[PDB]
Amino acid sequence: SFVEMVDNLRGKSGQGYYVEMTVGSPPQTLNILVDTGSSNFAVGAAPHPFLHRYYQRQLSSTYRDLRKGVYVPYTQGKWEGELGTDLVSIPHGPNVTVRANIAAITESDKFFINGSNWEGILGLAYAEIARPDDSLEPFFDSLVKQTHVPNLFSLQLCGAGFPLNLASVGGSMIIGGIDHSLYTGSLWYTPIRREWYYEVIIVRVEINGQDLKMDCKEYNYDKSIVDSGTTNLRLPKKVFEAAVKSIKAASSTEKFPDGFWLGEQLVCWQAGTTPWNIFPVISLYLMGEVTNQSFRITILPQQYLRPVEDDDCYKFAISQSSTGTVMGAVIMEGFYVVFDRARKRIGFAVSACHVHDEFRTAAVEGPFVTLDMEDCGYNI
Numbered sequence: 001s002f003v004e005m006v007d008n009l010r011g012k013s014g015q016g017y018y019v020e021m022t023v024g025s026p027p028q029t030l031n032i033l034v035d036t037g038s039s040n041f042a043v044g045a046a047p048h049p050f051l052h053r054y055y056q057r058q059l060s061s062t063y064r065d066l067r068k069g070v071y072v073p074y075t076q077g078k079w080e081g082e083l084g085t086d087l088v089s090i091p092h093g094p095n096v097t098v099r100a101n102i103a104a105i106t107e108s109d110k111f112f113i114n115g116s117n118w119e120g121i122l123g124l125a126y127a128e129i130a131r132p133d134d135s136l137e138p139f140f141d142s143l144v145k146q147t148h149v150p151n152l153f154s155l156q157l158c159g160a161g162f163p164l165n166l167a168s169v170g171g172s173m174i175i176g177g178i179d180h181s182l183y184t185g186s187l188w189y190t191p192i193r194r195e196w197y198y199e200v201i202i203v204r205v206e207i208n209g210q211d212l213k214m215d216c217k218e219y220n221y222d223k224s225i226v227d228s229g230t231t232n233l234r235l236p237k238k239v240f241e242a243a244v245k246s247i248k249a250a251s252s253t254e255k256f257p258d259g260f261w262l263g264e265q266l267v268c269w270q271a272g273t274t275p276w277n278i279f280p281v282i283s284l285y286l287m288g289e290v291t292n293q294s295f296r297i298t299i300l301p302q303q304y305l306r307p308v309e310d311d312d313c314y315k316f317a318i319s320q321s322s323t324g325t326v327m328g329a330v331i332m333e334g335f336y337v338v339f340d341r342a343r344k345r346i347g348f349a350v351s352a353c354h355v356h357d358e359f360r361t362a363a364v365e366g367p368f369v370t371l372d373m374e375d376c377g378y379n380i
């Protein structure tokens with residue numbers, strides 16, 4: 001249908017977006033973080049101070065132990081666990097059940113977040129980056145192989161301010177297709193360069209219409225990916241420095257502590273007086289499937305200035321990286337993103353929950369003629 005899947009995501013700002021899932025027999029309900037930046041399906045399977053509930057394998061008649069250990073280290077957090085298989089469903093997803101690999105998390109460190117409301121993670125990327133090795137079939141590969149669900153999903157991650165009905169921000173994960181009521185305008189597609197992370201190629205970057213003027217290999221230095229499990233826009237050292245230099249220049253009328261630009265300190269303004277006009281729009285051009293059909297996604301300050309609290313407070317959500325460009329949640333917010341795995345491409349369109357701005361508007365625009373995968377792709 002797809003209507004049954006609209007609004008199936010919830011989350012707290014900066015703590016990921018999650019979807020309801022069931023595991024075992026009888027079905028045990030768990031909220032699971034949707035992560036396109038990994039490929040392991042893992043759930044709390046032991047008591048933890050921040051876990052409201054967890055997966056009890058002893059109470060599932062369909063549980064099968066694989067007699068194998070596993071661990072996954074992320075950017076900061078990590079967990080270890082025991083591999084097994086079990087029946088998995090998504091109540092607000094397709095009407096199907098599948099036997100999938102499940103990493104039963106037995107110990108963890110800085111993985112679970114206090115009061116987040118999620119108890120596990122659903123890695124939606126490819127087998128190549130799955131631990132302990134690529135022989136561990138990811139959930140989405142299992143879903144597609146065992147059912148007739150088409151090989152593609154879409155994510156509409158919404159920012160704050162939209163009606164929901166535990167709170168702040170919602171979204172949609174349409175499994176097996178594209179829901180047209182979730183976006184406006186045209187969907188533009190960029191190739192998945194390789195099936196491991198959802199890797200793409202950035203061919204140009206503009207700040208307030210002014211080209212950053214860098215060797216485009218710098219934009220994809222190491223790699224460039226789409227990652228719903230990461231909050232910030234992460235930029236390679238050199239791009240980060242040139243970008244923050246343009247953003248500081250554009251916003252020079254006001255001055256902020258060095259801590260602000262490092263993403264550690266917050267900045268506030270009397271309620272409703274946020275001076276959005278002095279922060280520029282960032283345009284990221286993605287390589288077209290055909291290079292005279294490239295396109296840009298335009299990000300407003302309402303996206304890269306993430307709202308928090310203690311009247312209107314904000315965190316700078318652009319960070320330095322030594323591991324490539326990561327287009328995180330703040331980038332995906334306000335766009336409808338199609339992970340068209342069947343045709344090895346990712347689509348972008350303006351979301352129905354796009355960010356406001358009285359004088360500017362987020363956009364997905366093209367066509368543009370640009371450089372190639374060969375000119376812009378870093379070869380590792």
Ligand SMILES: CC(=O)N[C@@H](Cc1cc(F)cc(F)c1)[C@H](O)CN[C@@]1(c2cccc(C(C)(C)C)c2)CCc2[nH]ncc2C1
Pocket residue numbers: 015016033035037038039072073074075076077078110111112129197227229230231321323324326
């Ligand atoms: C912030 C973060 O760590 N997000 C991850 C999901 C997550 C959400 C959460 F709420 C708590 C938590 F502990 C983890 C997500 O998987 C991160 N994904 C990347 C990644 C980094 C370290 C290793 C991994 C694999 C080995 C592949 C799992 C992935 C993708 C690749 C990459 N290059 N630079 C940065 C990244 C981020």
